[PDB]
């Protein structure tokens, strides 16, 4: 294997042409569908928001049509989910890792309008959900679909294709090229086999998919949280406690998302029917939430930079955070069309702002700032029960532009999973394929 | 399929001994790290006031220059060549044929070798960087702790090796993402599946890293400001920079290959003759180091310079040209010390000649030639080491200029797809090869 290596070292990094161009053409669909999915959500919770003023003197008639626009949307998602596409329930990010492992199929000619509208349903109601789930599948389908339609042959394109998909999806999702790219290369790739996957291709349509969005997008960052103050390394050790904080709830919390997901199940039993009945209770939930405490309820993009800001009381984080850790759960584990990732950067973001708080009184002599620990948990959560760190601390510092916090938050990073690992926790995404692979042997 | 349920339910469960260790390596490659930069400038500031004491008699004041240059390069040559062979050149492809288990990594020898090997040669003002000392003695460090506590497995000996490396690239450029991304997209065994735990390589990167901010905090290698950002209607600029990288980078991998066989020449492998020549080189540096200091050194100084667009168009040809011959003499030469970072440094200097044609062609776009100098730093690294994510990512961490993400990741792949397509390969893994192919010959 001496002179083998001799002659793959020389042949290393040759992608093939053909996958190169298809991999531009896969990142640019992606984005303008993740463009398109994105002010499409954001359409239907205008409307929404307009028929409130409607009636915006009749408080009960006011909390009623709030709580119907979002179930209805909400049951158009999940019945669209249950018919059409069962595989296009809850993120899309396990599916799409199964595919890459073989293990999945990629119904795209069903999964792409099932997810995109379905998904448009359940974050348009004001769901407490994230487009990375709809845009991470639905980009990795599109991609399996220039596959078919151009009818490329070998592993290494339908792997490749696959997965500049799936990377063009997450970085449309945040404006994040970086965290995109990195996310196919730390949890998305097959993680106990050798494969070819291109990187210089996943690159390529990145690329594009990052442009496509920014042709509709500039001018406007998703998190603005302004340049915050650096961090002594005298202070250090209060963000690798911070990340044990996080790695001791990170598997808890994973318990949750999973074991909420079979305690909801037996509200339906799997029946079709009381399953969207379901999903419009909980859609007109947060649709409700909302408009009576709006940090409750949806993407939660908004309340970050408040929080980092210090501008929440310690009261509306732990609030903010038992709320959300409800509505989260209440909106994952149903199986509605939406991915956990985003809503972890609020949870984390509160959690580390609340650490922070007590930073700050604890002691005046750091000169803190309790903005700083907001940032180092964002990605903390991410890091907990995702495992994936590295995305996290990358998806951060593209989404908030503080390095000078670059310390801080990988010091939390790896205290967050460190202490997951300890704890006996696992990560998400691959404890849910694991959780789907079983059952496809279980009933059998 | 069966098996997968079983190893998704296990995944991400690194062995706790793994974890701990991971923690001393970075440790210990940092303060060696550290040492290493904290020699390499004494040396170089010795060296300055020794100039001074003979500041009026120029042929004596240009002699001295080169002498205290020329020692100290043989000082390094010398103990190369005498007792550890591998530590000669960058140190990087050592490393990662380490990972592939196809070379041995003798830490008892080039710890010292490469160490104060490269201290002489970086001291000298030669023109080589840091990385290739620190990853290759960070390597070995990781190497000497798996032997000292005798940890058992291929996991083990594959991890605590990568996060030697990873921590000693993470030291040289107070650059924690870059090191990490370093061994995942080229240290790391390319062609077959290994059990590197990534979680393992960052723990060693934050104490290395950590270990550089006790002694080198408040002041950065490369400051250059916040620069201007850059309009979607300008990016097209950013690849045809990436494409003139793109042909550039091959030609250039050619020419450190090649003359690395034309100074073989020279001395034909003699200890004697390679020593003296190793001289020879070193001390034109250090001579060039007082009459043209742009034209010698690691190259980080004209950065910022270069950026900030204080350069004349000629200054910036005659910089280049000048440094791809003094980065093949110090390089091919055999030198310990990396081709990595004086690779920033050309591409600083091609971009901001770029950006310069570009701010006279098209003053409807308020260009700013600092903003393709940035998009060039990481460029050369994408054409002729083939490792774009990396570099893309390192010049990110050095210049902290994240509004030009776009720019910089489409300058980066147009370097990489035009390295392909004009038939240039990976340094490193060309180095490696070249290695490789004598031993079975």
């Not at 990145?206 to 496509?212: D, K």
């Amino acid at each position: 294997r001496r002179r083998q290596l001799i002659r793959q070292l020389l042949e290393r990094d040759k992608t093939p042409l053909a996958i190169l161009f298809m991999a531009a053409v896969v990142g640019t669909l992606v984005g303008l569908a993740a463009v398109a999915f994105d002010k499409g959500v954001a359409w239907l919770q205008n409307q929404r928001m307009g028929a409130l003023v409607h009636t915006a003197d009749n408080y009960p008639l006011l909390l009623t049509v709030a709580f119907l626009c979002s179930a209805v949307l909400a049951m158009f998602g999940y019945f669209l989910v249950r018919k059409y596409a069962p595989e296009a329930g809850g993120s899309g990010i396990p599916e799409i890792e199964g595919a890459l492992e073989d293990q999945r199929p990629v119904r795209w000619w069903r999964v792409l309008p099932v997810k995109f509208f379905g998904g448009l349903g359940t974050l348009g109601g004001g769901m407490v959900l994230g487009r990375e789930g709809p845009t991470v599948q639905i980009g990795g389908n599109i991609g399996r679909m220039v596959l078919d339609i151009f009818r490329l042959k070998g592993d290494e394109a339908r792997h490749t294709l696959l997965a500049t998909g799936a990377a063009a999806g997450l970085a449309a999702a945040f404006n994040a090229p970086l965290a995109g790219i990195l996310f196919i290369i730390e949890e998305m790739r097959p993680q106990f086999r050798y494969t070819l996957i291109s990187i210089k291709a996943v690159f390529i349509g990145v690329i594009m998919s990052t442009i496509m969005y920014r042709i509709f997008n500039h001018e406007v960052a998703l998190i603005d949280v302004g340049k915050l103050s650096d961090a002594p390394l005298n202070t250090l050790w209060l963000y690798l406690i911070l990340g044990i904080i996080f790695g001791i709830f990170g598997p808890i919390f994973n318990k949750w998302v999973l074991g909420m997901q079979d305690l909801l199940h037996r509200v339906h039993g799997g029946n079709i029917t009381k399953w969207v009945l379901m999903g419009g209770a909980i859609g007109g939930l947060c649709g409700l939430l909302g408009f009576v405490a709006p940090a409750t309820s949806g993407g939660g993009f908004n309340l970050i930079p408040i929080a980092t800001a210090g501008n929440f009381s310690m009261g509306m984080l732990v609030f903010i955070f038992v709320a959300r850790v409800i509505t989260t759960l209440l909106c994952f584990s149903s199986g509605a069309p939406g991915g956990i990732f985003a809503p972890m950067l609020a949870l984390g973001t509160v959690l580390g702002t609340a650490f922070g708080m007590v930073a700050v009184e604890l002691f005046p002599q750091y000169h803190l700032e309790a903005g700083t620990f907001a940032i180092a948990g964002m990605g903390a959560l991410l890091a907990a029960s995702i495992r994936a760190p590295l995305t996290g601390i990358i998806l951060v510092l593209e989404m908030t532009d503080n390095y000078q916090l670059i310390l801080p938050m990988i010091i939390t990073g790896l205290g967050a999973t460190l202490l997951a690992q300890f704890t006996g926790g696992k990560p998400l995404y691959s404890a849910i394929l694991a959780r789907t692979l079983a059952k496809q042997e279980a009933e059998q």
